[model samples]
Target: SYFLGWQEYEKNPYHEVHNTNGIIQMGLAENQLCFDLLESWLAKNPEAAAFKKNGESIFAELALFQDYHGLPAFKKAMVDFMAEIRGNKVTFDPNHLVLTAGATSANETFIFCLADPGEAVLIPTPYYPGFDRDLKWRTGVEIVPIHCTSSNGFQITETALEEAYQEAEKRNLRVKGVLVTNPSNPLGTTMTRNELYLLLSFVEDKGIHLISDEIYSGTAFSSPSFISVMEVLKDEVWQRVHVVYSLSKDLGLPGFRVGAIYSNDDMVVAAATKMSSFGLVSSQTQHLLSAMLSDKKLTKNYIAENHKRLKQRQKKLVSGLQKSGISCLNGNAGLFCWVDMRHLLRSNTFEAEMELWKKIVYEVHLNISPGSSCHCTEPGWFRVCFANLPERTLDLAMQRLKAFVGEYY
Candidate 1:
């Protein structure tokens, strides 16, 4: 369900001439909206992407064995970059950082380090579809979904937290902690301070761990700016709280495979650092980012400009959907919009949801992600990515959707 749309679109991806009517990808939450900014910055700053500096090739020294701790400069810049996103209220220790190939690896590694084979972590419903595989495929950890309903716009309530915890215990699973996607993936909304406080208190009361996947912190394009758990962290709960991040969403570098774990627990950090050996970031990636991220002005401006681009793209998607008589959940961050297409569903059942999804994919040739795939209980909800396409491409998809809506229901 997670990668199904991706595979389908890739099989016959939309091209200007080669395949004009091929499937359009609206599933991947990639940050193509800021490539111009990324390209221009890289071009002007050759010392970063050139693989050489000071008139010498760095390959001779850089080709040596690399550590799971990653490059010193990269780690420092990564922390600084993260810190800046949180308004600089929180200071980070580079020593607490453990690098992995991507947020997927960092998540699995952190779960593996925290929970045992039979243990489980409570995650809210309608999360990133990859969680099932990333947290459980090999580590054997289980996910107990805290079912948040659409009535509350999918915000995790206190009752939902306690209910999920109790439900896991009844199922004979030891609840180790809670994992949440701040600035949620499919929903594209940032979590409120109250929700964060509720989670922290809930975890503390249970004496369990709390993992915040804040990979999209930099994508927060509008008001209610992103808040990391680190901003309000207290020394008392330091050991139990962990933050996972990557350049995949924040910097649009998924191929670079740069991810990190920030933990206050030294013991867990050491264990995760060792476990990172199996999924370390590439040395080449480490070198390039080490240079690029170290520049304060470039990193700062990239984030600022990236927000403006995302904001504009988001408005475009919203307007297109509105024209088709479709509405989306109010969102401020992330690469996709959580669309509500309940009026188009033949029925409120997931069966009908899939029926509409099939038509959209096979008939309309659009590859939007279905809410059911994200373990969402409701029907007719979809995650439509706007960042992956050019403005004209987005227009074409919207036009196709409008025609589909006109002919269908």
Candidate 2:
């Protein structure tokens, strides 16, 4: 059988949902905010798209196997891009970077490199539903949820982290690391500075690894800019921190399959670098990205413009939901809004959540993800991605949602 996420999607008759021309898929966390901008950038950088050596076209060079550590130019470009995104609060050494196929592979590689089979990583929930598969499955690592409720804006706490770790110990499972999503996936809330420090302190105290999934770092939309582990961690603590990042969300380039693992520890860099061969991004792809990302002017303009558009889209989604009597937790970053659907549910249970999700998908023609799938402890919350579609499509989704709830209430 397929994993739980794919199985859930398959059994839900998702293909039929897509078959309808009116379908509004709001479940995926894709950033279509700057498609035109990126297209323009690519068109402007045709030289980067094709591989050339010594003024002669050598496109075949890209087809050959590349250094497992990644192309030097690609690594430098990634480092620059990451530095620009983090507002230059920190600088990354290209030598410490290991390129992967995508964030999914980046995360899995870290789990494989850091934890032994059956060892657990404590994750704050409601988290990205895919983590169970990405961090586990073939690697044989386990996920231990640090339950954070909506009442607290799903903030991670030291107590919750300890509880999860202790709970794992009680079951005799080794707690190997703590994995966190800054500008979190399902919740879309960036962890506060205090929260980040708490996690850093906890991990440092326990001497466990800290894996910061900062794929959405550039998508932060509000004030008090997104803080990276690289920014705050001292050299000693930084040694224990590994970061997973991607161009998929920031540059709106999921199709490119460019993701990275950056670690201060030399051992991790070496180990993950070796593991990267299995998911090494094509040199052709890397060459293209290296050129595109190395253009400082273009990269800066795109990120600023993209964030502005994302803020507008998120604001529109929240306002539209509110107008329909639906409430959502205010979020400053990430691609989705955490919608409260408790009032629309038939009862306080996951079955009720699934029922509402089905109605939204099959009947209302909207494909939003229910919170249960993301390991949310509570019922009746959903993640409605606003960045994947155009404004008109988002409006249509809102209309469908209002109409669906109208029938229920």
Candidate 3:
């Protein structure tokens, strides 16, 4: 009766805990819009040199690029921007590039390229939930998850991956390739360059392909520049390293959805490009992305600012939790702080999460994403996107969380 009572109470307020929708209130999009408007307004006023985030100018480069028109010019800028940031650290070619609406679109294109009906595709956990649904609905591939340990920072180590591959082979499964989110989703731990290189070697030896999600790579606050798998091995790795990146997090342009999918495989590039021509990228957005790419200073500044903003908010969230004596896993980069509720709940984490959310939403208007949504191995962990809230709201959210945990425990 006690559990049932809790479950019944939970059903009414489940929306509060799994609030992926709260991002709309974060003013995340508004921050960018306001910046753009202020920049445009200030440019009209000579003294408005630094009105936006700092004394930084936004559209000066965009205004300049408006003079030149051609896909080649923008294409060159795109290639150069990526090449430069990618630095001399990796070997790459322009032929490797195929721009899409953003990382999601790139992911969709990559899935289409790699998977077919009934074929087995490997996804490492804890995974971004969209991958499974996208595979099922878009590509029809059977999603096989390689469950990783939280103790190991949710990394798909070489041995672990090899074993999954071996098991798949033993079962006569057609394992296409491994999907590795370099700075994995939900967990926020960055993969070392050497670790990535090792995985690449393993995949190569196994004659399988590798899709490395590096979108969140640059969001690291205190960590060193993430070592890309492409940086380790050029020619061969380039052929197989289906590197995906976007300006979504780094530039706070999720709406832009502009990203690049790169591989040295000409056939793969051709396949993706042909698929893309069906209006995968809006011509307008592509032009804006190109302009942003050309202004290295603008883009760099935006990424640096985003990293700073996220770090500030993330630290606040972390401190808020810790001050309440609620220890959370030390996340490195990315938007979320992952929490395990094993000690707080006995059954499916979602039920507990719903209960928590109901109490909070009814009490303090706070919300969080449940672990189950992230495909985590256990029911206890949940991911909180701290960057999606104001400082005061986060503090309140923390207080609410602390109170909830206090009561539940």
The local distance difference test score of each candidate is 0.89, 0.85, 0.64
Model 2, which residues run further than 4 Å from truth?
A: 1-21, 53-55
Candidates ranked, most accurate by TM-score first:
1, 2, 3
Which numbered prediction scores highest in TM-score against the true structure? 1
| Poorly placed runs, candidate 1 (over 4 Å) | 1-4
Candidate 2 residue pairs in backbone clash: none
Q: Which of 2 and 3 is the better model by TM-score?
A: 2
Clashes (N, CA, C under 3 Å) per candidate: 0, 0, 4
**Which digits, one per residue and each the tens of the lDDT, describe model 2 over residues 1-409?**
1133334445553232464344566778888888888788768666666576447776766777487978898899999999999888788999999999999999999999999998899999899978988999999898999999877788987789889988999878998889999978988888788888999899888889999999999999876578887777843677889899999988878888999999999999999999998999988889888888888898899989988999999999999999789888878889999999898888999998888787776677676788988889999999888997878778877777777767767
Best by lDDT: 1
Question: Compared with the true structure, what per-residue lDDT tens digits does model 1 show for residues 1-409?
Answer: 4455667788989997789999998988888877777777778878746668787888766778477777888899899998888878888899999999999999999999999998999999899989999999998899999998889889999999989988998989999999999989889999988899999999889999999999999999998778888876742666899999999987889998999999999999999999999998988889888887888888889889888889999999999999999999999999999999988989899988888898898888999999999989898899999988999999999999999999876
Q: Model 1 lDDT vs. the true structure?
A: 0.89
Local error of candidate 3 at residue 395 (angstroms):
1.6
Evaluate residue 154 in candidate 1 and report its C-alpha lDDT on the 0 to 100 scale: 92
Estimated TM-score for each candidate = 0.97, 0.93, 0.79
**Candidate RMSDs in order:** 1.5, 2.8, 7.0
